[PDB]
Symmetry: C4
Subunit: 109 residues, 4 copies
């Protein structure tokens, strides 16, 4: 199918393998692709990325986030209705109340 996402940087564009994408974030009306070594902008929506990203690795976990389960370090029940994801590079990502069942069902816990 496809195996790289092209992030927009200030001067050029950087092809990043899917394997190096940690998460994607909808923020300030754009999609930010957060890769291990850089961050950049993409024109596709999170809805479009859900179609194109491999469903074995990537999961919509919040209206504003797609996470790569291979960069998840730990999953915490931060409150009674949500999760908080500890990423391998120290970042955190929320699983919202509205995605929390889908998230845990798909991940099998």
């Amino acid at each position: 199918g496809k195996s790289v996402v092209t992030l927009k940087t200030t001067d050029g564009w950087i092809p990043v393998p899917f394997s190096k994408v940690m998460y994607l974030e909808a923020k300030d009306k754009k999609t930010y692709v957060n890769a291990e070594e850089l961050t950049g902008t993409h024109k596709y929506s999170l809805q479009e990325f859900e179609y194109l990203l491999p469903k074995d690795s990537f999961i919509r976990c919040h209206r504003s986030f797609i996470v790569n389960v291979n960069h998840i370090k730990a999953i915490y029940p931060d409150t009674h209705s949500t999760f908080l994801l500890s990423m391998d590079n120290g970042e955190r990502v929320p699983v919202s109340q509205s995605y929390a069942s889908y998230f845990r069902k798909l991940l099998g816990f």
Copy 2:
């Protein structure tokens, strides 16, 4: 699916299938033994046989599924039986009732 999510004391930990050494039924619970950690999972060994890659994982005992890629050596320890030396030093049994299936699948005989 790509990872298995192990239950921990404060949370859950996604582990790739490549890092799972073996799974053990114990006390009405499945224990997934990965390189860095062990945790529980809600699926039975029979459910995991369905969902784990058949090229890599094999039920070898009523209480164990082993990842063949973490078997260091296979030794006959009885008339009707094998014993698996794992990479990390541990040892997993192949019971009498699985020894024939086990060797047919791994192709020694």
Copy 3:
């Protein structure tokens, strides 16, 4: 297929597709440029488009096919044109006639 066999002065060298950076048509001959070496191949660029993985390789010029996994960054160098900075430091063109196809496939635009 898994490897491409490059012709050398004393012989031939199998290179995995992962190690091919780009292929270049020159003088009635295809040059496969791998990380450690360059050699010739009897297949045309058109033949190689058929046989190389579409997720990884793309014809970007009448004289080049590039491996997207060895592109370091993509820069616009003209109205109708891109220039590819490769990992090893080299630079490959995307000609006017391929620039649109190139960006549609890589998903920037």
Copy 4:
């Protein structure tokens, strides 16, 4: 499908991933599986292995040898009718006159 070959050693059996098999040799009425770190015996014939080994990596190159093209370092035309394969660990493997066309056709040179 399958992803390990079980070699017979003096005391036990050792599962080896296909990726670590360099070549197989029919010799003295047995099959010897030559892996990066050890050698051992298998009950299947070279004919049977041709069926079971991935055709993208493994090739029958001689009535007595199956080679893994991923462990080939260089291919030499040692005479006008044969090739000689330089393996990555320093060993050599012949491509006989009778397999030489099939070998070069499959490898594309």
